[PDB]
Ligand binder design. Sequence first.
Ligand code: HEM
Ligand code: HEM
Ligand code: HEM
Ligand code: HEM
Ligand SMILES: COC(=O)N(OC)c1ccccc1COc1ccn(-c2ccc(Cl)cc2)n1
Ligand SMILES: COC(=O)N(OC)c1ccccc1COc1ccn(-c2ccc(Cl)cc2)n1
Ligand code: FES
Lengths: 71, 62, 147, 378, 378, 49, 51, 48
Amino acid sequence: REFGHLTRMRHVITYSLSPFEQRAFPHYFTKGIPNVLRRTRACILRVAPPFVVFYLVYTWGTQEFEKSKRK
Amino acid sequence: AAPTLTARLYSLLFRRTSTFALTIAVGALFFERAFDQGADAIYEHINQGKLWKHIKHKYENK
Amino acid sequence: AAKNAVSQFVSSMSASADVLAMSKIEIKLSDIPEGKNMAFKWRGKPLFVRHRTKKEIDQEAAVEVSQLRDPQHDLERVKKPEWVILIGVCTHLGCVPIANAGDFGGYYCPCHGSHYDASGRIRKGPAPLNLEVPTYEFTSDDLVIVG
Amino acid sequence: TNIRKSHPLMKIINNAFIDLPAPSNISSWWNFGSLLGICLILQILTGLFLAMHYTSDTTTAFSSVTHICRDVNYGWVIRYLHANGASMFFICLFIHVGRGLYYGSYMFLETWNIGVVLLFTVMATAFMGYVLPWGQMSFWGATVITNLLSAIPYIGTDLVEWIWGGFSVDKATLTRFFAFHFILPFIITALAAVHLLFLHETGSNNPTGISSDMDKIPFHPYYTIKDILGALFMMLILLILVLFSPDLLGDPDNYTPANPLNTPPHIKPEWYFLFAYAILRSIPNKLGGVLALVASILILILMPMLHTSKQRSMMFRPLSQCLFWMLVADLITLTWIGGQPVEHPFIIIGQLASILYFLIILVLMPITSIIENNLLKW
Amino acid sequence: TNIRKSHPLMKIINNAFIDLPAPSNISSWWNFGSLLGICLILQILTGLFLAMHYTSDTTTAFSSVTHICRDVNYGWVIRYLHANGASMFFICLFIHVGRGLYYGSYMFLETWNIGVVLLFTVMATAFMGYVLPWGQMSFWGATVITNLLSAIPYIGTDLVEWIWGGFSVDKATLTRFFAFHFILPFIITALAAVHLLFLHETGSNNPTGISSDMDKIPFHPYYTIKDILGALFMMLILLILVLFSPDLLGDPDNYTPANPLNTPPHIKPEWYFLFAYAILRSIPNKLGGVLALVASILILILMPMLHTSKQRSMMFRPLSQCLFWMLVADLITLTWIGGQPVEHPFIIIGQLASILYFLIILVLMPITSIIENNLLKW
Amino acid sequence: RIAEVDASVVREVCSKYFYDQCPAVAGLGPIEQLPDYNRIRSGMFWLRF
Amino acid sequence: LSRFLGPRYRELARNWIPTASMWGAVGAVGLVWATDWRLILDWVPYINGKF
Amino acid sequence: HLVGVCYTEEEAKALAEEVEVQDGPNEDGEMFMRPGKLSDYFPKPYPN
Ligand code: HEM
Ligand code: HEM
Ligand code: HEM
Ligand code: HEM
Ligand SMILES: COC(=O)N(OC)c1ccccc1COc1ccn(-c2ccc(Cl)cc2)n1
Ligand SMILES: COC(=O)N(OC)c1ccccc1COc1ccn(-c2ccc(Cl)cc2)n1
Ligand code: FES
């Protein structure tokens, strides 16, 4: 696995700019803030509902531990 | 042209090299307990009456 | 190079001893009053050793097999009723506390409130077994060898 | 005539770190492999110091450790670098395994199987380092291993006596625990070079699960500067836990010395063993509990065989993403239960969560991938 | 489909030990390279035992070693395996260097230069292991190094104080000598893998000095069975010196404990340092004596530059063979002089033999090769 | 004669003629990669059976 | 599953189960002197192997 | 260390229960005397 022996490709053109010709910080809060809100919305219904059920079991488990030692 | 006794068990156990893989385990005996003939009978013969289990009947059941 | 160089590297890390006379064949004399358990770190745990009375085997025999789960008593394990040997190991976790604290002569575990014997017997849960005695025999006048 | 392509030693380094083809869309979750190599080197240049000034016996172990924090110069900083540096190793290891589980990296079969060996070796090492300071948590945590290790029906009673130095708690117990702790970190360093040699045959996986041979970039300078930045952020978190709260990850009862003096108010290990202590404690049989302890780590080897999806990773599988985060929330429950006393609500919870950890991996994950296969018309 | 030619780990072993092309006329002098690898492994699995039961302080060092021969089980056999196993390493090292000097193996420049580094590292290691038992020879032998180490005109007085633990003879002296002795044998193991990787680029030299690419044989089974037979003959000699005379190579005065109590009847190191102690003792200046000590080992690096013969080895050079055995007889003289007191006949002899060791290598050997070049009409 | 040959007969006759036997070898160049006779002779006996 | 199905798979495993006690009993004799298995050294009266 | 070389273990303890050396302390008291406890080095003559 060396660089000129990897795969076969035809009819593809790429254009690039030098790092000394561009800004290292482009649009940061103009593009970046609405981008990290799209990514948060796209994954919130998959990750979060398991950790809500851990919270409800934890509260029921510490409260029914203290309503056993009381009288 | 009768041969000598070097056809040991070559046609019987040693051809298919099944013996050779496990001579650490299977073909491993005859050389610990059969060598009570070895060093301990020789070492106590050079040192007769000098080890502790030679001078032993003098000091029990007194 | 299989049995005389592998299996022969044996005696420093095994039950064979660099303490070849441990303390059990040492001449043990009773510097101990009754009701006093000293923390004897002799093969690990404090071995429960003190005097004995004639009244002693009458209180453990007043509570019979109908209490227990794995029944064995004083005459089963001990040589004669003038001596006692235990280990300080709970059979699930591994501790019973300091002496002179209990109901009438046990060692009440203050972990969450269970109780245990001065002769190795189950009282409360949640441990399954009974306390283990080490193996030895009787030989002598006063030459005790516990092990 | 290029010297880094023709010198016999330099061309090994060039193929491994400089001219190596790498995918261009590699995320920050691929940073934690070189972080594990930083944490392992750091635990070696800090375990040098502690074993120098050390004596391991039943009479002096608890005081040999208190000598370093007060009397031995620069000993308070190096001791708590070592105790928190092992908590850092275990958080970088659970992120690393969960990455390869999520993106289907276990399809690299030889690399995945050497990894499962590496997870066993660091877990057994750290168990034999917490027994060395000899406090209450060192004693009662070691003496619940041997109850399930003497439960081996034939060889177990002579196995524990051979590793306890010879009888029980004594002087030479901490000469076989200490021997099994000085030398096990160096088998890990040799198992890590073999671990990377198998990955070099295919290169890396990427978050899409599709092969990336048309879009490779060199490793230098793109991921050499990205791995240096991620390592600097790890040293900031580690030195904050050492210089501002060096006892946050720990137990005060292990400052009470070891003796069979009295039963402790509780028994609990460090945080990275609390999921495993919760499983064996919910089995009322010392043979069934030692089998489910080994079956909670060696279950990772069945992950190549249980795969039924036509895709490799979980990026395009929304029903499987829900099950992955149910498994993470199940390991949080077992870490909490394993530091609780054995009472009424923490036995029915701690034993249903032990069941659901095996039900997700074996049954629920292979059926759900088949259901997603039918919905995409293959 | 041959698995030993295509598996990523098995094909490294196959190219190194099994299918490696080797000359067919290789002698028994080529056995001592794998013998050095057996002696280094043996000194690691025996130094495990000694550092386990050890305490290194000015009050208990002499008794920590006497505890092992009597009280520690199997400690008399393992201690004298370690003290005679280091004498075995040094006889297999002087044969090895004299082989490569005789047959012109120093023309493999990169392999020869890593070897000179390996000769320095084992010499400094064994010096810091004889100071550990703390007897009369341990004290007075260490305190003649620091007289020539404080003779460094700028940094030397703070150099010796940084390695003596902090002042002088004290508790912490043997915490920096012991640290510099536990870890130096593992730099040797990594320097030996690099040493063989450079030899693999050319293969081996042979006793004729002519390239042997038309007459190669595989390494297995011809030299795998020949290296096993030679290693069995080495274990016979080592176990004879351990089980029949374990104090033959040693000094009784190092059983007298260390104290500045009284000046000893003599001062002498082990046999493999007696050639070096004889050279510095014949220079009445503690800076000229520390320069000629380092110039007696680092002179080996000039051997590629001083070569003036048209042939490679010494098999066909009868005038050069006479000079090689004059050099061996000169090192026998220095080993005898270095165990003698500093009196009348042993100063004129010990300082003329120090001169002739440098006169043979630098002056007499390059001129004699040129004379033999003219006699063969080239 | 052909009809009375089966798989156990073939295993018996091939073990009689091939297994732990010394072969005769001939080679005509370029044959530098032809293996050594010790490696050819050890290829006649098997490892696992 | 028809993964490893076939009359060929247990035909080579038919002729190897005589020498597949070289898998299990060889492990049983491979742990006689590597372990010092105490109560199965009296498998024979022959091994009084330690004093 | 004398047992099995030139003495059996009785004939050995009696030579240790013949010299009197100083043991450690005990509470309700101070430094007391208790002779040979079967594992004791041979007694030095000089205190310094
Ligand atoms: C001491 C422990 C470990 C070290 C030093 C280590 C090191 C590394 C490194 C440097 C990489 C390449 C960079 C990366 O992708 O992060 C890697 C990748 C990988 N590791 Fe580990 N690792 C360790 C433990 C483990 C464990 C416990 C597992 C699994 C059970 C594992 C499985 C993998 C896999 C599958 C990959 C390739 C992932 C991919 O490319 O998608 N490793 N490891
Ligand atoms: C994978 C690497 C390592 C891990 C995970 C690890 C883990 C640990 C742990 C958990 C402790 C207990 C600290 C405490 O409870 O206060 C410890 C301390 C200790 N470790 Fe390690 N360690 C590692 C490397 C090493 C090395 C390389 C050595 C020896 C050279 C070593 C020897 C010791 C010693 C002697 C202690 C003494 C107790 C103390 O000083 O706190 N460990 N280590
Ligand atoms: C720990 C120390 C050493 C080890 C393990 C070691 C190992 C080896 C081995 C295995 C070989 C190949 C087999 C042989 O020809 O004997 C070899 C060859 C060689 N060694 Fe060493 N060696 C060590 C020290 C040295 C030293 C001190 C020198 C020289 C100053 C040296 C120079 C050479 C040379 C020049 C060769 C090639 C000789 C030839 O093929 O004619 N080595 N070494
Ligand atoms: C190249 C390898 C080695 C060499 C040449 C070497 C050499 C020596 C020497 C000359 C002694 C003095 C013995 C005596 O005078 O009675 C010694 C003892 C000692 N060595 Fe090593 N050794 C090596 C490997 C090791 C290793 C790997 C360790 C630690 C893991 C180690 C640690 C010690 C210690 C602590 C002692 C003192 C115990 C004693 O004096 O008996 N050495 N060694
Ligand atoms: C830092 O050390 C501790 O937390 N230790 O041990 C001193 C401790 C202390 C108190 C109570 C329990 C423990 C240990 O609890 C567990 C639970 C599972 N493992 C385990 C160990 C090794 C392997 Cl391979 C696999 C699993 N250990
Ligand atoms: C086994 O140890 C001894 O023989 N040691 O040292 C405790 C001893 C004991 C008494 C007197 C002298 C010595 C040492 O004499 C020499 C003479 C030369 N080196 C030397 C050391 C390191 C290096 Cl790199 C190069 C040369 N050492
Ligand atoms: S005493 Fe251990 S659980 Fe009750």
